[PDB]
Amino acid sequence: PLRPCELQRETAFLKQADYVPQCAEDGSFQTVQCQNDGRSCWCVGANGSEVLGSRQPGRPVACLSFCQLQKQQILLSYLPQCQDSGDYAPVQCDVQQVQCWCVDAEGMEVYGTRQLGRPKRCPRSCEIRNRRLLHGVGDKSPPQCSAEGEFMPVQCKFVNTTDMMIFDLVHSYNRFPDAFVTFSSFQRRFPEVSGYCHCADSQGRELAETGLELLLDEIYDTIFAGLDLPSTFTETTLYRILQRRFLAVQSVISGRFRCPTKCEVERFTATSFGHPYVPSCRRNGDYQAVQCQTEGPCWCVDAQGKEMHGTRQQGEPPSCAEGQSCASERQQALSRLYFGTSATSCPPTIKELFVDSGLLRPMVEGQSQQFSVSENLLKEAIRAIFPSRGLARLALQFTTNPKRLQQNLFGGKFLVNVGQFNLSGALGTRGTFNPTVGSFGFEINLQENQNALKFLASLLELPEFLLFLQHAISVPEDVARDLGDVMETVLSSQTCEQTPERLFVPSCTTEGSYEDVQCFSGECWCVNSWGKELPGSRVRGGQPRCPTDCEKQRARMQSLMGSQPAGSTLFVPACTSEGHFLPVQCFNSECYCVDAEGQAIPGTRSAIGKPKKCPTPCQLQSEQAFLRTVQALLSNS
Amino acid sequence: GSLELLADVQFALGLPFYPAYEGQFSLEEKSLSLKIMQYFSHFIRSGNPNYPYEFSRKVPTFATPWPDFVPRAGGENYKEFSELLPNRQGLKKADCSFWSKYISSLKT
Amino acid sequence: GSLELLADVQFALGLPFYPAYEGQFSLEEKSLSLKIMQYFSHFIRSGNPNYPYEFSRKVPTFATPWPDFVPRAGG
Amino acid sequence: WCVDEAGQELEGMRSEPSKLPTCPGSCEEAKLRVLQFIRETEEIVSASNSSRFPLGESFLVAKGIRLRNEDLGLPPLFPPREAFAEQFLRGSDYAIRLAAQSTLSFYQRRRFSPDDSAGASALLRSGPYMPQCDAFGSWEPVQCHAGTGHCWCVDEKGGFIPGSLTARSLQIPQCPTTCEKSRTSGLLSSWKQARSQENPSPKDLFVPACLETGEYARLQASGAGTWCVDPASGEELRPGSSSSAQCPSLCNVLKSGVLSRRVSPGYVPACRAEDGGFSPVQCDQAQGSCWCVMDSGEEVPGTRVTGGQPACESPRCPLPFNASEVVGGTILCQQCQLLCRQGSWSVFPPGQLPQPRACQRPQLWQTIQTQGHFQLQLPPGKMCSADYADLLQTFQVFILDELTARGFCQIQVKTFGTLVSIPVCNNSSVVNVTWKSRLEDIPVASLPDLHDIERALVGKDLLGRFTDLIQSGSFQLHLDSQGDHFGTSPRTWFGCSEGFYQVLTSEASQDGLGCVKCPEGSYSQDEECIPCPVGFYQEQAGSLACVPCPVGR
Amino acid sequence: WCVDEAGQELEGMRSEPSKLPTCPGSCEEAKLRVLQFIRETEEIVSASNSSRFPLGESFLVAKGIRLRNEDLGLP
Amino acid sequence: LALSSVVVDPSIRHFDVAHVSTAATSNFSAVRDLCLSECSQHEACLITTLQTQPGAVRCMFYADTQSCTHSLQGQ
Ligand SMILES: *[C@@H]1O[C@H](CO)[C@@H](O[C@@H]2O[C@H](CO)[C@@H](O[C@@H]3O[C@H](CO)[C@@H](O)[C@H](O[C@H]4O[C@H](CO)[C@@H](O)[C@H](O)[C@@H]4O)[C@@H]3O)[C@H](O)[C@H]2NC(C)=O)[C@H](O)[C@H]1NC(C)=O
Ligand SMILES: *[C@@H]1O[C@H](CO)[C@@H](O[C@@H]2O[C@H](CO)[C@@H](O[C@@H]3O[C@H](CO)[C@@H](O)[C@H](O)[C@@H]3O)[C@H](O)[C@H]2NC(C)=O)[C@H](O)[C@H]1NC(C)=O
Ligand SMILES: *[C@@H]1O[C@H](CO)[C@@H](O[C@@H]2O[C@H](CO)[C@@H](O)[C@H](O)[C@H]2NC(C)=O)[C@H](O)[C@H]1NC(C)=O
Ligand SMILES: *[C@@H]1O[C@H](CO)[C@@H](O[C@@H]2O[C@H](CO)[C@@H](O)[C@H](O)[C@H]2NC(C)=O)[C@H](O)[C@H]1NC(C)=O
Ligand SMILES: *[C@@H]1O[C@H](CO)[C@@H](O)[C@H](O)[C@H]1NC(C)=O
Ligand SMILES: *[C@@H]1O[C@H](CO)[C@@H](O)[C@H](O)[C@H]1NC(C)=O
Ligand SMILES: *[C@@H]1O[C@H](CO)[C@@H](O)[C@H](O)[C@H]1NC(C)=O
Ligand SMILES: *[C@@H]1O[C@H](CO)[C@@H](O)[C@H](O)[C@H]1NC(C)=O
Ligand SMILES: *[C@@H]1O[C@H](CO)[C@@H](O)[C@H](O)[C@H]1NC(C)=O
Ligand SMILES: *[C@@H]1O[C@H](CO)[C@@H](O)[C@H](O)[C@H]1NC(C)=O
Ligand SMILES: *[C@@H]1O[C@H](CO)[C@@H](O)[C@H](O)[C@H]1NC(C)=O
């Protein structure tokens, strides 16, 4: 099942050669390829053994993709039509418009799609594979498929130890004549069959040595056994039971309540084979804004990892910042200035019904106990446990008691069961032992994961979650595709307290960062890097002095002192009128004399009541420049 | 003050549009009473003053949305029948804390 | 907070001008403590913190005047 | 004279003892306010040329400091600085808009690439929103702002029916006039109108009936009976002497309204005494200028002259088709020409059968085009190592593939943090490359002005990168198994879509209305509407081809 | 060269390697500030004669609206 | 009714769908009268909307759902 790219990559890896072929997923050669730290890259044709004929040192600026390579081959008949990017269009037509068919971005034709004229509803890879499994292809268990023709990220072959031997039972035939809706009835009809679940690639390839988990059907006691058959096993509630159990097991692994996306798979593949370029990811599962190579070429990419052609900087950080957000509002306010004589803050019906109402406030902030990662974990939980609005509707018009809800969603109070490492996941390729690396080289902190899982377990028993999920169902679909997008947007609206005037233009720098002072209608104020004014900084006259490090530290220490017991005291830095540190900053009985920006001077630690002779800032700058000059005197040539 | 119907049932039943009370009511009162009519109608039709049907769930546009009344602390949202129709959180918190927590314990 | 003398007896006895507490106190604290020294001195000399003598009754200029404490409501 | 609603005499000298006044419509008054704003922001610029006022005066006015002429050692009203200062004090927001428009107008008028430079008005800045009225003065049901690209829909007198806003669409918005709104309101929820507003009965309430154009039908029927109603708005046409059967014609009741001084068009209608329709040649009581009209006095735009009796005779008696009435206009005197309604453009070069459906409603611009040049026009004049021009389309394909490999065909622009893509290439390379950007693909949140689109496209991102790549270094395509030249016009120009027609070919066309959808009985082929051939029949609008019928050729 | 009290070099070119600088007195510095104010309020008048700037620009500056040279079609 | 009196709202959960498939199309009046007679047979459906699919005709049946804008000028 391995592609030519994968086998060439592993054969070059086992020979420990200077070159291994860089190999993206879906078994396709990357259009740019380099030696292992060889620093001379080149752009390669379709089969990976080719060369453009001019290998430049470093990364090439850009090169033609497989579309354009095949097109230049045919020109130097039928014309392969391609889009702007390097991917074949889903409809490929002859140069005369008499025959059109469907491809899958690699070239070979889907057999049924050939017809006169233009086709509509071009089948995608999931429907092709699922139809092929009804035509004699080996695996008889249909892979789990989305509403459109796309593979579910988490799949379940679901059948092992059929007649005491381990292979896949004929599931597409199995589901139909015996109507199973209940696990106890399922084991009564079919014993010794245990659900083998995993997660899949973009093409549906099963991830190597990771996630190959087995689940026992014996433990769960069934709820919701009063519904009709849902016509497909992927639409059966047993598949959500398996998927929620699998995701709950992989919650403590990998730090993430999901199968990893394209970014982590590409990064782990690049790190494992020691490729010169490895993609850099973040928490949500996307490519970062800046993605440099090992030393030289640094550039920005979109969400699909395609290089933005006009930002290659060669060592310099390209800095395509998402925080760089002035010019939009600047030209919006300028356009509003020039109207006549007649994104945003947040979507309109969210701030008054969710945030200010008090629904998200217990959800993420009422029990905000060391949960910096757990807000993203909560977004993944809301996205994954409820994948559609209809299932959440059914769960909310059946479960009348919030205490039983976790019994009906997960595997029968499974969550506290996976809080204490009870076993329903024996005979799997993940585990067998116990800073700590993950299933794909993720950094793991087990007590944070278990504490957040117990917090989610306690939160799922709350009736205010039930009311919040009613309100989250009631949002229109155009604002948010799924419930995870609802959950993300209601987090985003926590800082949407903006009712600006129509004509306030935000002045900002040449590179576009916000100016430290913003003025309108005779007032001026200080803002941070984001567009929020600092409280109390508004002045009547103009030009406020924006607070320095000392004032921010003083405000933060005073605010943190506001929630502390009585006799306890902390270090509150004391500042001058303009905002410089006072020359002696003292603590409980030990007064030390600071120099600048809160950095203590060694050798001056002394008890309170002893008179000091700490130097003036002239002598401080004299020391600093003296050290600067003696260091610069140590220059090589 | 000459009327016997107070301001909430003035606006909800829509006194300012009556032919009897022809010119006694201002124009912004006539718009606010229309908004409160829409609130009460949307309640007694569906069950939620923001939506006229149980199945539509379109974004409200006639006025500001009316949040639900969650009974715990941190919420307890209520509408205020003012000119702008804003949302608040605490109604008579000190007074009802006196009349519920303290004086009931003193009664026992 | 490391001291045991609270802010009123810090300012009245004039801690910010001490050689021991040399640089720990800001400049506006050093002016305010001087004004509070003048208040307490004008009290313990005459009997009224606004006037240094019992017979001068010149308009105070160093700081804002200190009104008396009338015991009824309204004051 | 004319008056406001709240008993206030409008600006304008009182009319003569025997002279008919004219009062502006609801839209026309707002247009006069916008023209007042334009005149004031021009006079501020004209004051700025003459150096008649100090630079810091407006700063003092903004801060609230007002110094009279006595405080500056001046005669009491020799410099009119008091009115200039009060200009910035008739409001806050109006003052900021006045200052912004004045700064723009001064800087552009004194630096429009002057005599020391080239010219051609590259910025070509559009003015503020001036409302578009109907022929009489009522609000047009759709208003379009050329600067941004919005096209919202207004009510009867005010503006902005909520939710009707659209931005940069190929289809004109289809929003109903004042009759059809009340028609669907009466049909759906039974919110009917009243025959007379003093004290109606349930027999007096009616659901109105509209024509196909949109205006009110002549005879409205209720439960009580039938009556004749004004076609513009639905009030009783003759409240004194209403008659059901054979209700009075428009000219007679209009003249009765004029002579009783209840309606002020500025003239007296001299209509035909035969049928009650309008005679062709109504004009002012002071003889002066005279003109011609269609029905209901809709003021043919191209015939108003000061000469006595402008010849607007009926045309030749046969018509090009059995549909007799030309839609939206008439033929005035092949000895004659065709002229149609205000804010409408004839798609055909005569402005030879002249078609009935010959003028439509113009729309906004839809494509922006720029071009770049190379000196590979002929093989021996450049280093292509060939002398053959038989195959050149392969070179076009190879140059296009190299271009889209090196960016250059999908411009990326920031939107509040996240990047978005806009295609600018389709058969651009000809050598000549022609970037043609569709306006509907560009959002309204990003690039919110057409001139912002010009700045983003001619700027560093696309045209800045191209000249840097060509002139510095080389990107030479091998082809072993380009010459630099100035373009003589490296500038944007707007153009219509593939199915439409560009009516005012001057790119300096103000109000941004140059695209007209190609009409019913024609097809668009070369950015021009050619009438369909004889054996074929066309039933779409903007169809690009015409279809034959087998039965009845 | 000459310096302010808080380690800031005053306005003025640095003196030659063998050339004595001169630093203004306490009164002389304030007189230089007043002469700076007079020079600025004269140069505003000289700009007002030449008609080089629009009349409403200072109103936009006072209101807080600041338009750069790029927004006005300028170098 | 006309298309100008319609607000699109994809969140409605009270509606029925019916495709009518014809490649070599019949008279559109026939399928129109068939779908109208289908809604006439039932009592709950009050609104029938016909749309032309590429291979079929889609009849959508709705209960009476209206959005009313009320104001001081016109409801
Ligand atoms: C307003 O509310 C009223 C009150 O509920 C409501 O009237 C009810 O409508 C339902 C619609 O389902 C009726 O239920 C039907 O009753 C008949 C009685 O014979 C049954 O036969 C029906 O079943 C079959 O009907 C068809 C017969 O050919 C079949 O084609 C179909 O497939 C069914 O198998 C069905 O149960 C009910 O009788 C009325 N009346 C009452 C008193 O409930 C009304 O519809 C609501 N809406 C409107 C617009 O008025
Ligand atoms: C649709 O029609 C097919 C016709 O083949 C139905 O399949 C038949 O279903 C019955 C009932 O499930 C099967 O009977 C079973 O036989 C086994 C034999 O050991 C017995 O243990 C069970 O108790 C049960 O009686 C029958 O074998 C099967 N026939 C086949 C597969 O050829 C199918 O059930 C129908 N669809 C539905 C949803 O019922
Ligand atoms: C670990 O797992 C076992 C099996 O799931 C738990 O045993 C069950 O315990 C519950 C109550 O705790 C009983 O009601 C069941 O009858 C038990 N057997 C089953 C489900 O087969 C065990 O309690 C768990 N350990 C804990 C919670 O510490
Ligand atoms: C398309 O077919 C329908 C169905 O036959 C025709 O409808 C008939 O029209 C005639 C006269 O117009 C009526 O007398 C019949 O009652 C209608 N129904 C039937 C079932 O015959 C229709 O005329 C046809 N032609 C079109 C729409 O051009
Ligand atoms: C790539 O491989 C395919 C089949 O594996 C072959 O038909 C094609 O010619 C190859 N292309 C090359 C070697 O450029
Ligand atoms: C140059 O000097 C720096 C400073 O100590 C030192 O770290 C570095 O090794 C020197 N390099 C050479 C080539 O001498
Ligand atoms: C000012 O007006 C004069 C004519 O009145 C004109 O010649 C001149 O170009 C204008 N502009 C400037 C900047 O002088
Ligand atoms: C053409 O129009 C005239 C109206 O003047 C009408 O009498 C005649 O029947 C029409 N002929 C056809 C073929 O439509
Ligand atoms: C435009 O480009 C496409 C893509 O190659 C080509 O098929 C077509 O012939 C070109 N011309 C026109 C007029 O569409
Ligand atoms: C390319 O552009 C130049 C200048 O605009 C023009 O003279 C030339 O004819 C163009 N080439 C073609 C093939 O139209
Ligand atoms: C402006 O300057 C010119 C010479 O630079 C001078 O002659 C003139 O008097 C000044 N004032 C005015 C108002 O022109």
Side-chain angles (χ1 to χ4, degrees), chain B residues 5-21:
Chain B
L5 281 72
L6 276 178
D8 52 331
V9 75
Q10 275 180 4
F11 288 156
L13 296 184
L15 285 201
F17 291 98
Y18 277 37
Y21 317 108

Side-chain angles (χ1 to χ4, degrees), chain A residues 71 81 97, chain D residues 397 426-427:
Chain A
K71 209 190 287 191
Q81 293 104 50
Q97 280 62 23
Chain D
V397 173
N426 189 359
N427 288 304

Side-chain angles (χ1 to χ4, degrees), chain F:
Chain F
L1 302 187
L3 282 59
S4 73
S5 66
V6 173
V7 159
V8 178
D9 186 74
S11 163
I12 304 172
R13 321 157 57 246
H14 276 70
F15 74 114
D16 267 333
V17 193
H19 282 47
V20 180
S21 313
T22 176
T25 186
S26 176
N27 312 343
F28 178 80
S29 72
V31 57
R32 168 173 65 79
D33 297 8
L34 182 42
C35 278
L36 292 184
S37 88
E38 184 45 67
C39 195
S40 287
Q41 186 194 358
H42 285 105
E43 203 167 30
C45 70
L46 301 201
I47 284 151
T48 303
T49 76
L50 321 185
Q51 162 61 276
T52 300
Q53 289 282 268
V57 169
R58 188 174 215 192
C59 297
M60 285 193 90
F61 314 113
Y62 300 90
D64 196 286
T65 60
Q66 316 155 6
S67 68
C68 292
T69 70
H70 308 289
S71 49
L72 280 170
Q73 273 65 22
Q75 284 57 23

Side-chain angles (χ1 to χ4, degrees), chain B residues 16-73:
Chain B
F17 291 98
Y18 277 37
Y21 317 108
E22 181 46 71
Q24 324 200 357
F25 279 92
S26 158
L27 194 67
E28 66 254 13
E29 288 162 335
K30 271 172 63 157
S31 79
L32 161 65
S33 161
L34 194 45
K35 288 172 195 170
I36 299 191
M37 280 173 200
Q38 284 175 94
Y39 276 144
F40 277 69
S41 177
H42 284 56
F43 180 78
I44 62 183
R45 283 167 87 183
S46 81
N48 190 350
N50 305 306
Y51 314 120
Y53 302 106
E54 309 86 313
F55 46 74
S56 76
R57 292 303 172 267
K58 192 197 173 191
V59 54
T61 318
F62 58 96
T64 72
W66 192 328
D68 199 316
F69 178 76
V70 293
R72 299 174 312 114

Side-chain angles (χ1 to χ4, degrees), chain A residues 70-385:
Chain A
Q70 180 193 4
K71 209 190 287 191
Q72 294 202 334
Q73 212 50 50
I74 297 172
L75 274 296
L76 191 61
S77 303
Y78 150 75
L79 271 299
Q81 293 104 50
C82 197
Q83 314 174 0
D84 62 358
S85 48
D87 43 349
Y88 290 120
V91 181
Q92 289 313 303
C93 295
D94 194 353
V95 55
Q96 61 268 10
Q97 280 62 23
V98 307
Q99 279 204 342
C100 301
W101 54 97
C102 281
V103 308
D104 57 357
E106 278 77 64
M108 51 66 58
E109 170 181 7
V110 194
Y111 41 91
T113 65
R114 175 160 297 284
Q115 75 174 0
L116 180 65
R118 270 301 176 99
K120 277 74 69 177
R121 179 71 274 172
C122 176
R124 212 167 288 102
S125 56
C126 175
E127 305 166 356
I128 299 159
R129 178 152 174 190
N130 209 315
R131 176 160 312 287
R132 273 183 189 167
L133 296 199
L134 262 67
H135 282 179
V137 186
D139 286 335
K140 293 321 173 201
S141 163
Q144 284 74 16
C145 200
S146 66
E148 72 283 356
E150 200 44 50
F151 283 135
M152 201 76 38
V154 175
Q155 289 191 357
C156 292
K157 307 289 188 280
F158 164 76
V159 285
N160 271 341
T161 79
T162 52
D163 208 319
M164 284 73 74
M165 73 291 291
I166 301 103
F167 69 102
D168 313 334
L169 180 66
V170 56
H171 187 273
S172 80
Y173 163 68
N174 189 359
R175 158 159 180 78
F176 193 98
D178 312 337
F180 58 97
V181 73
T182 294
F183 277 169
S184 79
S185 85
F186 175 53
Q187 306 149 59
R188 162 179 180 175
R189 184 46 59 93
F190 305 123
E192 77 165 0
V193 174
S194 180
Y196 160 63
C197 296
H198 54 69
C199 78
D201 286 13
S202 303
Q203 191 185 6
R205 304 181 183 280
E206 196 274 329
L207 276 297
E209 295 299 325
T210 45
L212 288 82
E213 300 189 5
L214 190 88
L215 307 182
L216 320 173
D217 307 350
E218 207 288 322
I219 305 102
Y220 181 75
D221 295 330
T222 70
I223 307 299
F224 290 176
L227 322 173
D228 288 359
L229 277 296
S231 168
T232 301
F233 166 62
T234 67
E235 268 75 0
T236 315
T237 186
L238 317 181
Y239 173 57
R240 276 84 66 190
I241 290 288
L242 293 198
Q243 165 179 314
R244 289 170 201 156
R245 276 172 173 263
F246 178 94
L247 275 181
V249 165
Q250 199 164 353
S251 165
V252 292
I253 319 297
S254 81
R256 291 156 174 75
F257 183 76
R258 75 183 182 275
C259 176
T261 61
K262 179 165 77 72
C263 191
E264 293 86 3
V265 173
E266 287 290 339
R267 164 180 196 179
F268 178 76
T269 288
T271 318
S272 171
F273 293 89
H275 287 104
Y277 167 59
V278 61
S280 81
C281 299
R282 58 179 70 121
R283 267 295 295 107
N284 54 30
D286 78 17
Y287 300 104
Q288 292 179 349
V290 290
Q291 279 198 347
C292 196
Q293 205 190 8
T294 181
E295 272 62 59
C298 308
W299 74 99
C300 307
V301 291
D302 55 344
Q304 303 323 109
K306 177 68 173 180
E307 163 168 29
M308 295 299 103
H309 171 262
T311 180
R312 178 185 303 278
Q313 272 318 111
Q314 193 36 32
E316 202 272 322
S319 308
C320 317
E322 65 286 343
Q324 178 40 250
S325 163
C326 172
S328 172
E329 305 89 321
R330 175 71 186 264
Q331 63 214 1
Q332 286 284 340
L334 278 194
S335 178
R336 252 200 319 281
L337 201 67
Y338 304 142
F339 186 77
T341 309
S342 178
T344 178
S345 173
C346 53
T349 181
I350 286 174
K351 167 73 165 324
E352 314 85 344
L353 275 152
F354 277 116
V355 171
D356 279 9
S357 170
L359 264 63
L360 178 143
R361 187 219 54 72
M363 181 95 57
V364 68
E365 289 327 289
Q367 200 54 41
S368 65
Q369 212 172 359
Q370 61 272 346
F371 286 151
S372 64
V373 188
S374 176
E375 54 92 29
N376 193 15
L377 172 51
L378 175 53
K379 292 191 284 289
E380 299 141 14
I382 294 318
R383 183 174 298 102
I385 305 160

Side-chain angles (χ1 to χ4, degrees), chain E:
Chain E
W1 60 83
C2 291
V3 67
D4 194 357
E5 152 64 37
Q8 174 43 57
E9 172 154 356
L10 303 193
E11 185 36 70
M13 61 80 71
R14 298 162 141 75
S15 164
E16 203 274 349
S18 297
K19 267 312 169 195
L20 273 54
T22 182
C23 302
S26 178
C27 172
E28 197 81 38
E29 192 265 329
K31 180 194 293 227
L32 285 188
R33 303 251 311 289
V34 177
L35 265 295
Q36 193 82 7
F37 173 89
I38 292 191
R39 283 178 288 175
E40 294 186 352
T41 197
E42 176 65 28
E43 85 180 5
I44 290 174
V45 174
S46 70
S48 292
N49 189 359
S50 54
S51 76
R52 280 269 319 287
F53 297 90
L55 267 167
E57 167 76 40
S58 52
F59 193 101
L60 279 181
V61 167
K63 288 305 192 169
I65 312 313
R66 293 171 41 55
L67 317 179
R68 291 194 297 274
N69 273 292
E70 310 150 348
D71 309 329
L72 314 181
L74 282 176

Side-chain angles (χ1 to χ4, degrees), chain A residues 21 26 79 104 146 210 253 404 436 441 464 552 562 633:
Chain A
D26 191 359
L79 271 299
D104 57 357
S146 66
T210 45
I253 319 297
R404 294 180 58 257
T436 308
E464 270 78 5
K552 301 162 183 185
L633 172 63

